[PDB]
Design a protein around this ligand. Structure first.
Ligand code: QEM
Lengths: 387, 344, 51
């Protein structure tokens, strides 16, 4: 009667570990301990990828883990940390749940099948961009992206968003990361009629892009600048132009909140999973086991259908890729070399706060776009009767 | 005088594997290894244990398994430790979607693009214009689809693709969404892109729809079969596939070709650069920067009048492939031989 | 049978461009396992279905 089920996890510190264990205690406390009983298992991030895959194969998988949590480790891991864990657990199709990881490379069901997350990726910011362009009705924007999987995913998502309206596109500027001179691309943008620039790239790239745009005087009045969370953070924040618009996801740096949310979703999933029959136990070790865990795709199915409205980050619903939907965002404006909240993104569309919207150049209210219609270069052809 | 260490890991097979089974100026050292289980922890640990103080720069790996995961493991290790790895037989030689530019992992298996091209050549040879596409979300399906769509664009010849259906294997089958998607199939030729287990389940599902019956011929890449000896009972009779040469190309010969590739690459940078920390966790010797030149040189290899040269996607450039057909007796028979240019 | 034959009778003498692509009879006397209902119904095309 008192049967136990093990749950694996990987967190930042023993503190977060204790948080997780407390969450498990509350989980068995808020559920029946008569039928099934919960057991907490967690390990700290290993120094290297290999050692972490090993830590999964012994400290986690050998313990028969039904799920594996992943958060950002102490000191910056560049968000590539959960990958080998998503691999190892993914081999057995053991669902892996992300917490602080925003990288869009995990939105591919191809590379990581068992990988979901409690935060939306950077590509999903195109939702907030979509409500922004919705209420303000901006029909012209230049899309400046670095050449990589991330930027191309964000690009694809924004285009899909732009695919909503008929034939909506202005210019696509793709650049290779680490390029010091963007002057060519920026001039090709400057030749374009649209004065509104949307740049999605890494911080160190954003510094050079902002540097080149500042060199081209594209940060002045008449122009609008809408960026993401990576662009306002780090080395780029110093070089950020005034009037720049940005976004910040709620509980992004927060592990414990997401630890709790994940614990809740996992609770629902586990309690819902034992309601069926023919439920097989996860492998008791990596060693000697070639075959995958047969219950894994089912548990994943249950996880992606999980609805948890009471989450600390708000309503929790997962998209097809496994990314979080209906996540709350914070719109940020740059006024007088200071960040300010002009509103927040909740559910559908956007609600504007009492703070006054500021634009580059320091203009109080200036929703000016598409600018000048001027002398047009005419490409033509040679045809005897006509030309 | 100069000498380099190489580790050869072979996994337990049904067939007889004997460890006892033109050396170049650089002298190779062969470490023979036999492994029971192909699981990730076993592979990673044994490889890291075989490393030890032996200072092995090159690694030769092959398996009898049907697991396509082995190539992902090997690629992960090669990418992480910046070390050359050559997939030889079976699972290690199977296909992946996209590998990093830093990855030195190379496979003797054919590129997915060339697989799809060969398949299309099969379709042309038997003159099948009407076909269908079923792919899973397993890595490479996008490449496959995009190759068929690429070929159908510039062809002046008559071509029709009725359907492209993408099945999600990440979820358990209850609602039978797989059945509902597969029952929509019409065309006589169905291109199925998926792993062997996926191929088994999907072929099992197709029986309910009757797509494995006569009038329907399935044309599949090397990813599904991958072993001519072991044939799943759920595989439909008359299944066409593409296989790397087995009778013609021996397993020890493959390993030989791998050592040849490694040695030739090391000798190529010997003439060019004129000039090896071994462990998992880290290397104080650096040299990661010089590893790239070694990889670039490892790309192009001319040996014995035959090019073993690899591709940027990580696969082999032009390996010999034979088209096989599953007969009534449920054994793979060779229905074709496909060369560089001409098609037999 | 009366329903089908009636629809075909009325549709026989119709000068209109009427077309019925398929007539599918599902057997409910036996429990559905092989999913013959599924297989028969998925083959359906036409926009209007008389059930
Ligand atoms: C790509 C595979 C999982 N894939 C990644 C992990 C690998 C095992 C591994 C563990 C540790 C280090 C390296 C490698 C095994 C293969 C999965 O997403 C998938 C399978 C089938 C499918 O239709 C779609 C997606």
């Amino acid at each position: 009667d008192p049967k136990i089920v093990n749950i694996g996890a990987v967190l930042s510190t023993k503190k977060h570990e204790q948080i997780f264990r407390e969450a498990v205690n509350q989980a068995n406390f808020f559920h029946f301990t008569r039928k099934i009983q919960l057991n907490a298992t967690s390990v700290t991030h290993r120094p290297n990828a290999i050692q972490m895959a090993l830590s999964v194969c012994e400290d986690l998988i050998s313990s028969q883990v039904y799920a594996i949590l992943v958060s950002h480790p102490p000191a910056p891991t560049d968000h590539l940390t959960p990958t080998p864990i998503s691999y190892t657990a993914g081999f057995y199709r053991i669902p892996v749940i992300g917490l602080t990881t925003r990288m869009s490379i995990y939105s591919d069901k191809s590379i990581h099948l068992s990988f979901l997350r409690t935060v939306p990726p950077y590509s999903h910011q195109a939702l907030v961009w979509f409500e922004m362009m919705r209420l303000f009705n901006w029909n012209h924007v230049i899309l400046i992206v670095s050449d990589d999987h991330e930027g191309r995913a964000a690009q694809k998502k924004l285009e899909t968003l732009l695919e909503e309206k008929e034939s909506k596109a202005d210019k696509v500027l793709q650049f290779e990361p680490g390029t010091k001179n963007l002057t060519a691309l920026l001039l090709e943008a400057k030749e374009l009629e649209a004065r509104v620039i949307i740049l999605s790239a890494s911080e160190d790239d954003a510094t050079a892009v902002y540097k080149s745009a500042a060199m081209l005087d594209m940060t002045g009045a008449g122009y609008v600048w809408l960026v993401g969370e990576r662009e306002i953070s780090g080395s780029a924040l110093r070089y950020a132009p005034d009037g720049i618009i940005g976004l910040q996801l709620i509980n992004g740096k927060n592990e414990s909140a997401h630890i709790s949310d994940a614990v809740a979703v996992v609770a629902q999933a586990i309690h819902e999973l034992f309601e069926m029959e023919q439920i097989t136990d996860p492998p008791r070790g990596c060693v000697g086991n070639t075959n995958i865990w047969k219950t894994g795709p089912l548990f994943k199915r249950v996880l992606m259908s999980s609805k948890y409205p009471d989450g600390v980050t708000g309503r929790i619903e997962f998209n097809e890729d496994g990314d979080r939907k209906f996540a709350q965002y914070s719109i940020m404006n740059l006024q007088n070399r200071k960040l300010v909240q002009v509103g927040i993104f909740d559910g559908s569309y956007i609600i504007q706060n009492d703070r006054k919207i500021i634009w580059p150049g320091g203009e109080t209210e200036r929703p000016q776009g598409y600018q000048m219609s001027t002398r047009l270069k005419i490409v033509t052809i040679h045809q005897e009767p006509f030309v | 005088h100069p000498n380099m260490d190489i580790a050869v890991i072979l996994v337990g097979t049904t067939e007889e594997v004997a460890i006892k089974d033109h050396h170049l100026p650089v002298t190779p050292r062969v470490e023979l290894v036999t492994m029971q289980e192909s699981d990730p922890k076993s592979i990673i640990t044994r490889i890291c244990d075989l490393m030890s103080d032996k200072k092995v720069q090159g690694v030769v790996f092959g398996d009898d398994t049907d697991q396509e995961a082995i190539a992902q493991i090997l690629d992960f290790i090669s990418v992480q430790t910046l070390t050359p790895i050559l997939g030889i037989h079976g699972g290690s030689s199977m296909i992946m979607a996209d590998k990093e530019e830093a990855s030195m992992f190379f496979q003797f298996g054919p590129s997915i693009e060339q697989q799809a091209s060969v398949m299309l050549n099969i379709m042309e040879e038997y003159d099948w214009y009407i076909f269908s596409i079923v792919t899973t979300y397993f890595p490479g399906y996008q490449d496959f689809e995009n190759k068929v769509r690429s070929t159908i664009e510039n062809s002046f010849v008559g071509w029709e693709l009725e359907e492209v259906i993408h099945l999600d294997m990440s979820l358990d089958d209850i609602d039978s969404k797989i059945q509902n998607q597969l029952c929509k199939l019409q065309s006589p030729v169905i291109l199925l892109y998926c792993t062997k287990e996926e191929a088994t389940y999907i072929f099992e599902v197709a029986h309910s729809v009757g797509l494995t019956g006569y009038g329907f011929t399935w044309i599949v890449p090397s990813l599904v079969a991958g072993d001519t000896d072991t044939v799943p009972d759920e595989f439909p009779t008359g299944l066409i596939s593409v296989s790397y040469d087995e009778w013609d190309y021996d397993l020890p010969a493959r390993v030989r070709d791998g050592i040849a590739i490694i040695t030739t690459a090391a000798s190529t940078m010997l003439s060019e650069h004129n000039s090896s920390k071994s462990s998992c966790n880290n290397i104080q010797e650096s040299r990661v920067y010089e590893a790239h030149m070694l990889k670039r040189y490892l790309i192009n290899v001319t040996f014995e009048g035959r090019d073993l040269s690899f591709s940027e996607d990580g696969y082999q450039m032009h390996p010999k492939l034979v088209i096989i057909l599953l007969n009534q007796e449920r054994k793979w028979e060779r229905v074709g031989k496909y060369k560089d240019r001409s098609l037999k």
